[PDB]
Each structure stands twice: as C-alpha cells, then as structure tokens.
Subunit: 296 residues, 4 copies
C-alpha cells in the first residue's frame, strides 16, 4: 500500500500565521503529479508540534480530501500522550485516512512496558493500519526489535515502521524478527538506498517535498532492481539531502520551495525560525542547481 | 528566592484518572511542614506531558492557592510550542505563581536561533522570573553556555537555570559566563552536592517528593558549609536517588509514597505505567529502609 | 585489487601461547579454497594489540608467503604511534604485502592536523597502497570526509577505506568527496550489503573467518547485481554476524572455529578471555546450525 | 599516601626527539617546590603511547630517582596488552616507584571478564598499590562500579581510582560500593572540586603541570574544608582548565610552559602535533594572564 517515495508534507502558513490551505492543496496536487506515491500530513516535517488539535485535524482532513483516493494517506497521529494519540487516530480514521504514523513517545521516556501500553492502546482504539515511527535522534529512547516484534505479533493492524535510525543493520533485524511482510519504510533520506536493499520498500521523505520527481525516479529505479541507476540518482540527491538539515529541515525545505517558485511562504512557528545563515542558503542553492531544479 | 530543597511535585490521580486534588493539597502541606523551601508544580515529575491544558493550569492554580505565600511557587510552563509556553506562563502569572520553569524545547530540536526566539518570546510576554530547564537527556539538544549567558544579559527576567545535565563543570562555566547573581539549581539529585559547591544554591528534586525532611536537612548542611555532614546525608540518600530511576521516576516515586503510607494512588497516565518489576520495588524498599523512614 | 569477501584473519595461538603457525597457514589455505578474495593479517581480529613487534611481522610474513600470489594481502600496520606504524608498514612492504591497513590512532586522540601528519608520514615512507581504517567505536575520534578527501588528493597511495562506522550515508559522502575510484570496503559485516549498493566493493569481514564460503557467495551475488539473492544470504548470515559480537569477536570466532572442527585452539591473549557465557555459545551454535555449517 | 594536587607529568623531548632528561628533572624539582604532593610519570599526559618500552622505563626510573622519596611516585603502567602492563609494573616496582596507575584497556574493548583478568593478573604480579584509571572518553568501555568493587574486595593491592569520567555521581557510588578507605582521585581538572566533596581526596591533574602552586593551594583549601576559598580558586583556574583541551592537552601544556618561560620545548610525537591554532594559543595566554602567572 505504501511504497517508493512518500513526502512527509510541510504545513505552509500564511503571513498571518494561519494554515495556508490553498498552498497546502497546491503542494499535494504537485507532489502527486510529480510521482509521489503516498502522503504523510501533520508529521514532524508538517510541524505537528506547533499545530493545535483543530489545525492538526484540519491538515489531515484537507490532505485526505485533496488526495481523493489517487494515493494513500498515512496521517500523523504522534503524541507523547496516549490519550491525545487515540483522539488524533480516531479523527484520522473517521475522516478517511488510509493509515496512521505513530511516533515513539518523546520527552517523557516511557520504558518498554510503556511502549507496549501506548501502541497497544492506539491499535485497539482504531482499525486502520499503524506504522511505528522510530526516531531516537528526536525521542532519545529507541524501540528495540523485540518490542517491535511483540507488537506485530499481538496487534494485526500494527503493520510497518518508519525507521529514522539510519542504522540499516536494524532493517535486517526487523525483517527477520517481524517477517518479510512487515512493511519497512526509511525515515532517513540519505540512507534510504541501502535501507531498501536490506528489505525496505520506500521512504517517508523530507527531500521529496523539494524534489518530488527525482525522488520518485530514484525509488522507481530501486523497485525495478536497477541499482546502478539508483546509485546515480543517490549521488545527485545526496548533497541536497544533506544541505536540507544543516539547519532545521522545516525552514530549509520552505526556503528551497520559495526559491523554486512554489507558492509557499517562509513562515514557520516558534521555536522554529525562518532565518537561515547565508552559508546554509548557499549550500541548498548549490545542491538544487546541481540537480537542475530551477525553471528559470 | 529559590534555594535549598525544592520538590518537582508529582501530580496524583484518582482511580478514575482525575486529578486527585485532596491528595495534591495534602502532599504540598506535608512538603512545606517537612522543610521544602519551594515548589515546582506541573513539571516533568508532575507528568505535565499527559495533562490537558486545563488540568495543567488547575495543577498550578491549586499549588499557588495551597502554598498561600508560605513558600515560593515556580510553575512549570514548559512546551515545545512557543505559543503554548506563553499561554501557560501568562496563566501562571495571573494565578499568582512566583516564577516560571521553562524547558528547552523537546522533539522538534530548534537550533540556537530558535532557543533565543523561544525564551525571548516568553520573557517578553511575562514579568515573572524565568528559570531555564536544561535537560538534554530528555530534549536531545542542550542549551550551551554562550546562549544561556546571552539570554541572561538580554532579558532581566531570565534569572536562573535548573541544570539537569549532571555534568558539574557546566556549573562553573555558567557561574563565570552568567555571573554569580545567576541562580543555579541542580536538576540531578545524585550530583546536587557537588553542584552546590561549584556555585549552585539548591536542587529541584525528584527525591524530595519521597523524603522531604532529609533532603531539606541535606541542603541545610550545605547552606551552612557543613560539608562533612552533607556527605553523610549524601551517603544515606544516594541509594534512594538511584533506586527511583531504575524505572521511570513518576511511577517509582508514587510507589515509594504508597509504601510510606501517604494517600497517593499508584495511577499514572499512559505512556507511563504503574507496574514496576519486583526487583525495582525491592530496591526502592531497601533504600527507604536504609533511611529508616520505613522499617526502623 | 581488493574486492568481495576479505577475512580479517584471526591469529591462532598454541596451548603455550606461541603463534600456532601450522593452524594459521591451514586457515589461510582454507579461506582461499572457500572463495575469500584477499587477506588481512595482524589486524584487530588478528589480536594485533597483544602481538609483539616480532610476532606481528611474523604473522604478516607467514600470510604473504602462504598466499603465494593467489590472493592479495593487505597487512595490518595500525598503531597509535606514527613511528611504529612506519616500521610495520616498511616491514610489510619489504616482505611482499600488496597493501596496508592503517587504523585511525586510538587512545591518544589526535586532532585533524594529527591525522594528516600520521597518514601523510606513513604514505611518504612506503610506496604500497594504503587503506584508512575508520572505526570510532574503538578509536573514539572519527576521520571526517574532508580529512579523508584531503589525504586522497595529497597522497597518490592513499587509495581506500575500511569503513567500520555502520552509517552507510558516509559511503555516499566518501564516494562523492573522494571519487568513485576511491576503494570503499565495509568494516561492518551486518551492513556490508547496503554499504556496497552505496558504492562499496567488498567487506573486510569478521564472519568470513567462520563462514568463508557463504560470505564469498554473498559478495559474489552483490557484484553480479543479484540483490534479491544477496538479501537471501543476508537473512541467513545476519544472526551469525550478530551472535559473533555478543562478547568480543576474537574469542567468539575461535569458539566457533573450534566447534566446526578447524584446528584452532580457544587461546586468546589477555585482556581477551576465551571463557564465553553459555547463552553466547548457544546463540553462536544456533546461528551456525541455521546456516548448516557443521560437517557432522 | 596520594592526596591533593598530583601532576600527570609531561615528557619533554629535545629538538632531536630524544627524552630531554634535564628538562624533565627540572620540571619535577619545580613541581615539588611549588607544592605538588605526588607525581605520575609516563601516563597519558606523559605521551606514554609514543614512548618505546625502554623510554617508558627510563621516564619512570628518572622520576623515581629525582623525587628521591620527597613525594610519592605513581608510575604509569597502562597498556591494552596485559603482558606489557605486567612488565611495566614490575619494572616500576623494581626501580622504586610507590604505586601504579593502570588504565582500563583501550581499543580492543575487553568485556567485564577481561577487565577482571587484566587487573587481576597485574595485581598478582606486583606488591605495589594499584590505582584503576577509568577514562571512557579515551578507552570507549567504562569499568562499572560492581566490577571496581569486586576488584577492591578481591585484591588488597587495588587501592584506588583515577576517575576521569567527570560524572561526579560515580564518586558517591564508588564510595558506597568500595568503602571510604578506597582512595578516589579526580581525573578531570574541571570537576575536581565537586569530586572531592563527594569523597575524593585529590586530583591527578593536567593543569598542575602549568600552574602547580595555585592547584596546590586549591587542593589545600578543600583539604581544610574552606570550600568558599576553593570556589574562588575554581573560578580563577577554570578558564585555564578549559583552554588546555581546546586542542590536545599534550601540546597545549607544553605551549603554556614555554609561554611561562620554563625550559620545555614544544616538541611532541606524531600523531600529536605541536602547531596550535592562533585562537587556541590566545585562549591559553588569556587564561594564564587571568591567574597573573604571566602579565601581572
Ligand atoms: N506541542 C504538543 C502538542 C501538539 C498537538 C497537535 N499535534 C506536542 O508536541 O505534543
Ligand atoms: N503532550 C503535549 C501537550 C501537553 C500540554 C499540557 N502540559 C506535550 O507534552 O507537549
Ligand atoms: N599493544 C600495543 C602494541 C602492539 C604492537 C604490535 N601490533 C598497541 O596496541 O599499540
Ligand atoms: N603505542 C603502544 C605501545 C606503547 C608502549 C610503551 N608505553 C600503546 O600505546 O599501547
């Protein structure tokens, strides 16, 4: 259901700090037309941390309606509060999302029993498929392979992982412990190539916001087994992947999209800031031009 | 204003998962009569992550009202969303809190510019004194000493730090960069002793929830320069400091409080769980026995 | 020159703690006959830390003589003392090694200028090709991509890397910064598959000591672009890769070889110990049997 | 026996890269007359990694002879090769050293069983007191408190620790597990103050090479319980503690000594380099000026 290049969509804001709904709808249409295979609204890259409950729901709602069944929608339902996750998960189901992305809780650092209680409570509260989002670089704690396998064995609708660890040996361990039917998606653009050869089938991607067509061509080469061609795309994309997280990727992606002529403002919500260093903007501009993305 | 032993208060819940207001008031009264010198409600140990906005405000309001000016109240106003932090901070000011505890944003990983914008926006929106809560073991990012000093120089109401790093050399760096008028409080029970000899003046403490009198006597001896007696207290308290974070401190503290016979239920909110391993519970019982506070 | 499966050879010892030269010669012959493509004597897995200078030289000498030109020999010349590295490097050249493996210095933590002085002094002292061995999990410091590229640009005989980081995004960065002619070899068995699709051409391998034939078949599938078959081998090998470093791989490899009927004693040199926990031996035995390696 | 300020002595070299014996003797004499209470020759700050076996022994012999029983001598006998450690330890005993400093093995990463075998074998081969040097920032592995306590319980000549972790809570754990007769010495200049109030009795110090008198006055004030005066010294010394490890401490200390006008050349041994960045040198000059020891 979810495979190849799946953008973790930005949430564009107006000059007055409201949701820029027109810009968001335009962004989704453009992503679909350039070859993105699925959509993740209201995730980390969507600045879900700085959305209200109502805005978060509206972002998921708009994405589902705009996709109109052409591509599947995996709604962000991540929280460090299980009660809030269930409410976001039930909202997404009732509005027509195809699946849920649920991050390992951040800041309060549950132990293994807490991870089982968190993901099990969410799984019992909806019937949608659930992807575990494992990202210790943001959550500190890491779900281990034993816990992940127990959850897959216990709950039929825990079906996959967004693995942002960048340690691709874990993809082998997850494939063996959880089964080859467990759906593994890379959560790290720069290692998504090797992640797929270890058993992944796609990437929930930051860079796809900015370069959706090449990102899709890259994942298509992989799924066709043309790994020589996939490595050519990797060499082209790698500098952009890297330049987009010199500073926080939220503001770097919006900077790049604005520069490319997309109708996306630079506005982000504190504690993100839209001011980038000149050296950062230079690195992004050079990586964009290497790929050849400026229409002008 | 804030010195010696300051509990990071637990938030007790009823069996039906409401705030147990009677238990909370009783805990505060007991804390004050056993010698705690201040109170931090609705912090990390207070399970702020799983309180609603309404419940968070209620916990702060009820602490301020109960304390009634007897000891100063430093309200938790931490969030990874600057707008939410401003709203919690202004509610705490309006309800009568004496100061604010503001954690470095978690999960979304702002850069230094983002930290300046976050703490600056809060400082601009209230007149209360603000304490920076630096805890990279939960937030991943760490505020560095240049950033902390710049905030202190820029905003007269950024007055201190809760330093949970446990790396005591930072207390010297912060003392030199921010000045000796900068109020440093340990955020790490096990190294609070060394933190004060490097320039700290107290501890925002997990263990004080369970053993307020002995923690207060410990901080009193340091304040009086009786560091020989303080080491004796360190040796009695250290096993309990350590036993309370074998598993998450929230559940460990509430278990210890029930073991002491206080009117605190074991209920915590998911993703936290109240069930502790048998070996954890026995480690806590033995450390409590060692301070006589049970068996003897 | 170096490609596919290259064992980091153990150094077997007698009951009386001398070099077991017969066992070592037998091990090399067997490796060559099972398909290993190159040899690394007197590296980390060869217990180079506990060899005298004279033993180290003798191990390199024996390996070169035994290989007799059938496969190339990359002699370990690693030290945290540049003077010692030059002496080991010149010995290896003069005895007929085909190349050198030079680890980033351990324990004394040189800075970038020290890495340039170390690798440049060695490169100027021999004419053999040199592979940089980057392994921060043992050395703490990590050579960065800029330093590695500068060394490749400055010294024509610095030609490759054994990359033990297990972070395969670095293979993309090294390929771009150093060129596609820079020879990248995985130093991490469990991620060698994805390392090759990012641009690696082989693996200097711990596990190849124990399962040389499957390890060679695995690397041959990769070099033929049969990545579906390579993933089948990965699933078979991954449990063995992992079980061999539950405890130090030196003693785990020797345990496994002894169990398989090879003429290799369990003897290792302190601070390694040959005693393994029963759970470790069980995990190794199950992984060996899954692969089907016991002749009996 | 070992207390207060104990320099981890540099090893000066002549312009022709021999041991500068006259400079070494002069450094020791000066150290003793400025109030250092003990001496550690041929340690990490002594560049033990780049000394030959013969030179290492010579450095220990010359220190013992120069000291002449005036202050006790704790000889570096660290190696990652147990056999080498035994040989250095027995040479130090035979030449007249008073104790031994033995680092946790680096690079080859023994497990706990290996640590017991390493330190047990050394303890069995000498009658001198042995101090465990725990420094995971250089060795990666850390000896845990149960292992340290088991070694202390098992071997009567394992008497103390040089604890370079800088995590002061470990001093309390070691004090409780190993007993208050266990001799704890800070291995981290910047946190030595807090380490002693937690139970330490001195510091094996890098900074003492450069400022022996003030370091001795600092440790004297702690010994006398004048922790107010000790904090004043902390504030004067901390910028120099920090300036001496911007770049590797070896070269930084020798640069500071030349800046003071001592007869110490800048020569260090590769992979260390003597060239320091201009900003590093100025940070060192300013910190020296701040303790008046130059300009005033
Ligand atoms: N800032 C809070 C609330 C976000 C709620 C909507 N996603 C958090 O990151 O958990
Ligand atoms: N769970 C969210 C919202 C909590 C808001 C009330 N304290 C967070 O931890 O940021
Ligand atoms: N044990 C020392 C010497 C080994 C010399 C022969 N390889 C080291 O690891 O550097
Ligand atoms: N360089 C080797 C040998 C030094 C032997 C004399 N100290 C090591 O650091 O282990």
């Amino acid at each position: 259901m979810f495979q190849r290049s799946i953008p973790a969509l930005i949430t564009p804001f107006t000059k007055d700090n409201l949701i820029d709904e027109d810009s968001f709808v335009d962004h989704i249409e453009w992503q679909i037309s350039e070859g993105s295979s699925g959509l993740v609204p209201a995730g980390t890259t969507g600045e879900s941390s700085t959305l209200s409950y109502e805005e978060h729901c509206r972002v998921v709602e708009l994405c589902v309606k705009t996709a109109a069944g052409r591509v599947p929608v995996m709604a962000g339902a991540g929280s460090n509060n299980t009660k809030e996750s269930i409410e976001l998960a039930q909202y997404a189901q009732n509005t027509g999302a195809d699946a849920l992305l649920v991050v390992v809780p951040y800041y309060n650092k549950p132990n293994k029993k807490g991870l089982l209680a968190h993901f099990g409570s969410i799984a019992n509260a909806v019937s949608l498929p659930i992807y575990i989002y494992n990202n210790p670089s943001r959550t500190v704690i890491e779900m281990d392979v034993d816990t992940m396998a127990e959850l897959v064995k216990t709950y039929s609708n825990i079906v996959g992982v967004k693995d942002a660890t960048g340690r691709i040996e874990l993809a082998s361990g997850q494939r063996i412990a959880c089964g080859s039917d467990f759906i593994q998606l890379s959560g790290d653009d720069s290692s998504a190539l090797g992640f797929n050869v270890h058993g992944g089938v796609g990437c929930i991607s930051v860079t796809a916001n900015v370069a959706p067509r090449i990102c899709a061509e890259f994942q298509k080469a992989i799924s066709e087994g043309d790994y020589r061609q996939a490595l050519e795309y990797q060499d082209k994309l790698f500098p952009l992947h890297q330049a987009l997280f010199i500073e926080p990727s939220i503001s770097s992606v919006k900077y790049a999209l604005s520069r490319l002529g997309r109708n996306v403002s630079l506005v982000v919500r504190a504690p993100m800031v839209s001011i980038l260093e000149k050296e950062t903007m230079f690195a992004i501009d050079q990586a964009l031009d290497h790929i050849g993305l400026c229409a002008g």
